């Protein structure tokens, strides 16, 4: 069982990751984990990727594909894998198919932009402590203040309404062809695809997945 898991930032696609891992006996893998593990391993693709990173440059599609190919060859992925957040472009999807990295299911996690905004914007932090708060799901005892110190809270640049909306626009635009690429491969019969309403409770999403995957 080889699964691709796509979704917008804050769509909470990972909320079903452990369920998928436990029902198939497969690891969760991401390009990030591949990079940090490859450089730590002192392997070849590692030293190469370490230079690009430390130089502050982007990693080439060519190098990423080679890392994915490397990872799914281990005994780890005898029963398959759960690829998270990759591919991100059509050319990447092609290079994977070129590298013989076939996939059984492509799951798309759907949460409308508006719900993600309210979900993300609500987050606050007390920086010197690292303590996390939320207006609606995890409210502090004293509104707009830390429960412990009593020092005022703070919000980060990454959770601001304009920053989030800007981040979602880019993703939708950038991923639009990829969603069509895999949706077409579905009706073509080279793989399977399925939209998923992530707005439902965790239990119902798990149910929806169990029938999609079987």
Residue numbers in the entry: 1 to 214
Publication excerpt:
AdK catalysis, which plays a vital role in cellular energy homeostasis by catalysing the reversible magnesium-dependent formation of ADP from AMP and ATP10, is dependent on distinct ATP- and AMP-binding subdomains (ATPlid and AMPbd).
The Tyr171 to Trp (Y171W) mutation was selected because it was anticipated that this mutation would modulate the enzyme's dynamics and facilitate stopped-flow measurements of the enzyme's ligand binding kinetics. The apo and holo structures of both variant enzymes are very similar to that of the wild type with only minor differences in the conformations of their AMPbd and ATPlid domains. Analysis of the Cα displacements in the X-ray structures of the apo- and Ap5a-bound states compared with wild-type AdK of the two AdK variants revealed that the displacements of the apo states were significantly more variable than those of the Ap5a-bound states. Inspection of the proteins' NMR spectra indicated that the Y171W mutation significantly reduced the rate constant of the enzyme's conformational interconversion (kconf) relative to that for the wild type or the P177A mutant (as discussed further below). Since a similarly strong correlation was observed between the kcat and KM values for the AdK variants examined in this work, we conclude that the effect of the Y171W and P177A replacements merely perturbs the functional energy landscape of wild-type AdK, and that the conclusions drawn from experiments on Y171W are relevant to the functional cycle of wild-type AdK.
